[model samples]
Structure formats: structure tokens, C-alpha cells
Target: MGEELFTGVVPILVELDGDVNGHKFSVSGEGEGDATYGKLTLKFISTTGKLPVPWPTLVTTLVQCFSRYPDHMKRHDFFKSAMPEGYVQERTIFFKDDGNYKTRAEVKFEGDTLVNRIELKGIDFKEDGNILGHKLEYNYNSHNVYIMADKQKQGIKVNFKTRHNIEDGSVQLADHYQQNTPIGDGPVLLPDNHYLSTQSALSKDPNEKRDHMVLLEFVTAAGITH
Candidate 1:
């Protein structure tokens, strides 16, 4: 074949259910963002009903997974040196409907990092504030990964075990929603004439823009000039 025009990066989006007795309690979002060296995967749970017993634990586990990457470590160092001083993590409340609460922990970065900040929000099922919840925040330095539980010590072991499973791979894969053409190692770049599948079983509602899932694929080239 002649010189290829694009690179391939497989992106998969998955929704997970947290349950033990077959009763669906919570939902999670997960996927893989691939690069030449390896892959940058992400896993996040949505804040829904009954204060998911495993959601807080999952958040703590994901942050630690990101920390183990050599690329992330180098990026962290670069960010620290280049970013101006006085950057800080800020805690904010996301939603409140008649005391049904949700909150986010975010760290703002002022540098070359494409992301201005990373935030994790907690979804509280009980409006009365009887149960524990979760929130995460990571900046240039220390990654503030914490689980807000009713009894901190009681759930630590379970959370740790769950985290371990995640590091070892416990998620599944599905079909790609779109055929993405790769530009770089960052987010997937969509084609100019992208189309939505009207009969696709994997597709979401056409009207719903916020909660839709998409897949991206691309390939890399050698010694290519930018």
C-alpha cells in the first residue's frame, strides 16, 4: 500500500451496572483511548439511585490507575514546571433540586495541558443526607482521591479490592459508534461529513444530545511532519 493517510486508535464506550442481587443500582461509563506507547483508559460511574455501594470505591480506584502511567508522570512534571504558581483545586456544587444534591471536586491548571481542570462529582441518592458519597480532584501535584463513606474504615478494604480489579481489567468492550480519523494523541477527531445511524441498535436517541455515546478509530504514521 502507498503511504497511509491516517492512524488508527480504537475507542470503546461501555456502560456498567453495579449490583449484587441482580437489582440494577448504579451505572458506570468506561472506555479506552489508545496511543502508540499503550492506552489511556477511563472509567467513571454516574450518580444515580440509592447511593451506589461501590461508586465511591470505583472513583478512588480510577485515579490511582491514571497515576501508574509513565506518560502521565512525565506530563505531570511538565505541567508543574510550565504552569504558573498559585493553581488550586476547587470544590463546587453541581446540582440541587429540593435538596437532592450533587457536588464536584476540580483542580484548575494554567499551562499547556489541554484540560484546564479535572473534576469528579458525587451523586447522592438520598436527599436526607443519611448515606455517604464520593468526589475526586486531581491537579499537578498530589491527586486528591478520596471516598466519603458513612464508615470510612469499613469500606476501605472493599474499595481497595475493586480498585485492584480495575487495574487488572474487569471491563468489557462494545461496537464503535463512529469511524474516527486520528489526528494526534489527544481526543478523537470526527470526519467532516459524519452521519448518525438511524437503524443502529448501538445508537442512542437522535434528540438526546447530552447522554449519547460515541466510538472513534484512527491509525498512526511514521516520521510524518505536522
Candidate 2:
């Protein structure tokens, strides 16, 4: 009876800029963020070098799917005719081998919402105040996440992190839980989040020194339906 993983804020947007060149952009462990659009979610996560690469092709593929399936209002009809009947449709966006790492972004549907997340497996982030080289993987979300948009009203929240905030992902319940203890700024919700914690291991190594750690499904209030 505590808080749910879907506990945070629908960050308010203040500005809008940039174009969706996709190729005209690049990040160095800096632009690792998330964002939402209609019924779709996008994200980038990794602990390799504050710089990186999964899902290079997957992400692009999904985009390709949309661009090809249809366009304009006709696109909507195509989705309705092609996608499931109200069942959330999911897919692997793409996998990328940028220069230093690999990232995979996945998409799915849950409770009338779009869900997508990323992963940076087996990496050594070094000692830089990281969760410290602890492999992390997730959907619609990741730890140091943000939104990639010039869109308004739904700025960062649109990162598929949902309207409010969320620790959105499947974790080992046996470890994420504790007696009267809280997780992700709130308690775990039954059948929703894992009841466990790894603070000890996260605390063992110090020096601000670290390695790699493994880490949303976002539901737009716009009521994105199949």
C-alpha cells in the first residue's frame, strides 16, 4: 500500500527547437534520453562511455515501418487495419553500433499505452558517480533519462516515461523490496513493480569510483488507441 512505479510528474514543457534529421544528431553519454509521440515511444540508454551504441537498426526500422506503412491520415487507417484490434502492438525499433557501444530499443503496448525502452549490456562505465558499471536495461525509461522534443505541453513526460514519472521496468522483486522501505521515491505496487533493493552492492564500491549497472512504457493522456 505504498506508491506505484507510475509515480512522478508530467514535466511541463517550456521550449521547442531542432529538426528530426535523426542523422544530424549525436550524443556523448550526454543525450541519453526518452520521448513520446502519439502512440509511440523513443529512448537511448547506455553506460559504456557517457557516449555509445543497441538498437541501432531496430529504432530506424520502426521508423521505416511507419514511413512505409502509410502517411498522413491514410497512415492512421493503415495502422487500424494492420495493427491488432485494440491490443498494443510492439516491435524492436533498431540496434546501433555507434562508435563505442551498442543499444537496443524495444516497443510494446500495455493498458492502452505505448511502451519502449533501451539496454546497455556488459559495460564498464568507470568511476564517475555512475550506478558504477552495473548493466541496466529498461523500457520507456532509464535512470538519467530526458525527452527529445521541440514539442510542447508534453516535454520530457513525452519520453514515454508517462504523464507522471515512473521507474517503469521489470526488476527482480525478491531484491527490490524491503520491510516498510520505499523504492523509486515510493513503495512498490503489487503485481506492478518488483519488491527488492540492491543498495548494498550499489554502496559497497566507493571513490565515487564505479563500473556499470543495469537499469517506461509511457501512456500519453492523448489516449493513444489502436
Q: What does candidate 1 score on TM? A: 0.24
Clashes of each: 6, 56
Off by over 4 Å in 1: 1-7, 20-24, 39-48, 53-56, 60-226
- How close to the true structure is residue 21 of candidate 2, measured as C-alpha lDDT? 16
Model 1 over residues 1-226: C-alpha lDDT tens digits?
A: 1001102333323333343222234444445434333333444434355533323332321211111213322322111222222122223222222111121212122231212223334453433321222221111111112222112221111110111112223321111111111112222111111111111012233664443322122212111122
Model 2 regions more than 4 Å off = 1-98, 121-226
Model 2, position 143: C-alpha lDDT score:
23
Worst 10 residues of 1 by lDDT: 155-164
